[PDB]
Amino acid sequence: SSDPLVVAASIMGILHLILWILDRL
Amino acid sequence: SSDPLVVAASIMGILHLILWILDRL
Amino acid sequence: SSDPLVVAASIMGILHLILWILDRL
Amino acid sequence: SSDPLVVAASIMGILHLILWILDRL
Ligand SMILES: CCCCCCCCO[C@H]1O[C@@H](CO)[C@H](O)[C@H](O)[C@@H]1O
Ligand SMILES: CCCCCCCCO[C@H]1O[C@@H](CO)[C@H](O)[C@H](O)[C@@H]1O
Ligand SMILES: CCCCCCCCO[C@H]1O[C@@H](CO)[C@H](O)[C@H](O)[C@@H]1O
Ligand SMILES: [Cl-]
């Protein structure tokens, strides 16, 4: 499976997209 | 192999690049 | 080992972040 | 475990987030 550090960076990417979308709305 | 979440973040990233390329063309 | 989609996105992220850093200098 | 390029991209993503925060400070 993926390294915790990689998991953490992917979560950061996903949250950033969600925050950006919420801001645009 | 890779965690679902990490695969999903990668697909978002690839889509992000496609969209940017399309915008610039 | 990593999913091939994850390696490909990582390589794109690296190039992107490299360009970002050069500009920030 | 995760490929070296995947680990590297994740670290560079974390570096970017931190440079972005410090930039605003
Ligand atoms: C603690 C983990 C939360 C990470 C989510 C916040 C990431 C915000 O950081 C981002 O702000 C962007 C604005 O769209 C800028 O374009 C920057 O490139 C930066 O990466
Ligand atoms: C998960 C990592 C995938 C990385 C995909 C890169 C997303 C491309 O998108 C970015 O392209 C840059 C130039 O290439 C532009 O300066 C913009 O910041 C754009 O958002
Ligand atoms: C800019 C900072 C980037 C640092 C990148 C370090 C990533 C390497 O890290 C990798 O090294 C491998 C050696 O082949 C080990 O086998 C480990 O699996 C590890 O993932
Ligand atoms: Cl991985």
mmCIF file with all atom_site columns, C-alpha atoms in Angstrom, chain C:
data_model
loop_
_atom_site.group_PDB
_atom_site.id
_atom_site.type_symbol
_atom_site.label_atom_id
_atom_site.label_alt_id
_atom_site.label_comp_id
_atom_site.label_asym_id
_atom_site.label_entity_id
_atom_site.label_seq_id
_atom_site.pdbx_PDB_ins_code
_atom_site.Cartn_x
_atom_site.Cartn_y
_atom_site.Cartn_z
_atom_site.occupancy
_atom_site.B_iso_or_equiv
_atom_site.pdbx_formal_charge
_atom_site.auth_seq_id
_atom_site.auth_comp_id
_atom_site.auth_asym_id
_atom_site.auth_atom_id
_atom_site.pdbx_PDB_model_num
ATOM 1  C CA . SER C 1 1  ? 5.146  -0.789 -5.955  1.00 0.00 ? 1  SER C CA 1
ATOM 2  C CA . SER C 1 2  ? 3.184  2.319  -6.994  1.00 0.00 ? 2  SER C CA 1
ATOM 3  C CA . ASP C 1 3  ? 0.278  2.313  -9.475  1.00 0.00 ? 3  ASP C CA 1
ATOM 4  C CA . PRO C 1 4  ? 1.498  3.535  -12.897 1.00 0.00 ? 4  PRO C CA 1
ATOM 5  C CA . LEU C 1 5  ? -1.090 6.400  -12.790 1.00 0.00 ? 5  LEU C CA 1
ATOM 6  C CA . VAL C 1 6  ? 0.489  7.554  -9.535  1.00 0.00 ? 6  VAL C CA 1
ATOM 7  C CA . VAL C 1 7  ? 4.067  7.556  -10.959 1.00 0.00 ? 7  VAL C CA 1
ATOM 8  C CA . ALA C 1 8  ? 2.861  9.540  -14.008 1.00 0.00 ? 8  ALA C CA 1
ATOM 9  C CA . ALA C 1 9  ? 1.023  12.128 -11.920 1.00 0.00 ? 9  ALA C CA 1
ATOM 10 C CA . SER C 1 10 ? 4.101  12.378 -9.619  1.00 0.00 ? 10 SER C CA 1
ATOM 11 C CA . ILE C 1 11 ? 6.380  13.097 -12.609 1.00 0.00 ? 11 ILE C CA 1
ATOM 12 C CA . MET C 1 12 ? 3.966  15.877 -13.774 1.00 0.00 ? 12 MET C CA 1
ATOM 13 C CA . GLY C 1 13 ? 3.832  17.307 -10.229 1.00 0.00 ? 13 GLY C CA 1
ATOM 14 C CA . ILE C 1 14 ? 7.658  17.376 -10.093 1.00 0.00 ? 14 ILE C CA 1
ATOM 15 C CA . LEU C 1 15 ? 7.971  19.274 -13.428 1.00 0.00 ? 15 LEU C CA 1
ATOM 16 C CA . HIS C 1 16 ? 5.210  21.656 -12.277 1.00 0.00 ? 16 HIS C CA 1
ATOM 17 C CA . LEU C 1 17 ? 6.838  22.352 -8.900  1.00 0.00 ? 17 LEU C CA 1
ATOM 18 C CA . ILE C 1 18 ? 10.261 22.815 -10.555 1.00 0.00 ? 18 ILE C CA 1
ATOM 19 C CA . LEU C 1 19 ? 8.832  25.523 -12.846 1.00 0.00 ? 19 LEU C CA 1
ATOM 20 C CA . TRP C 1 20 ? 7.052  27.063 -9.860  1.00 0.00 ? 20 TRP C CA 1
ATOM 21 C CA . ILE C 1 21 ? 10.330 27.293 -7.826  1.00 0.00 ? 21 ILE C CA 1
ATOM 22 C CA . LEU C 1 22 ? 12.384 28.763 -10.727 1.00 0.00 ? 22 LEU C CA 1
ATOM 23 C CA . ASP C 1 23 ? 9.799  31.509 -11.159 1.00 0.00 ? 23 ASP C CA 1
ATOM 24 C CA . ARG C 1 24 ? 9.754  32.208 -7.372  1.00 0.00 ? 24 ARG C CA 1
ATOM 25 C CA . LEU C 1 25 ? 13.542 32.808 -7.349  1.00 0.00 ? 25 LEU C CA 1
#
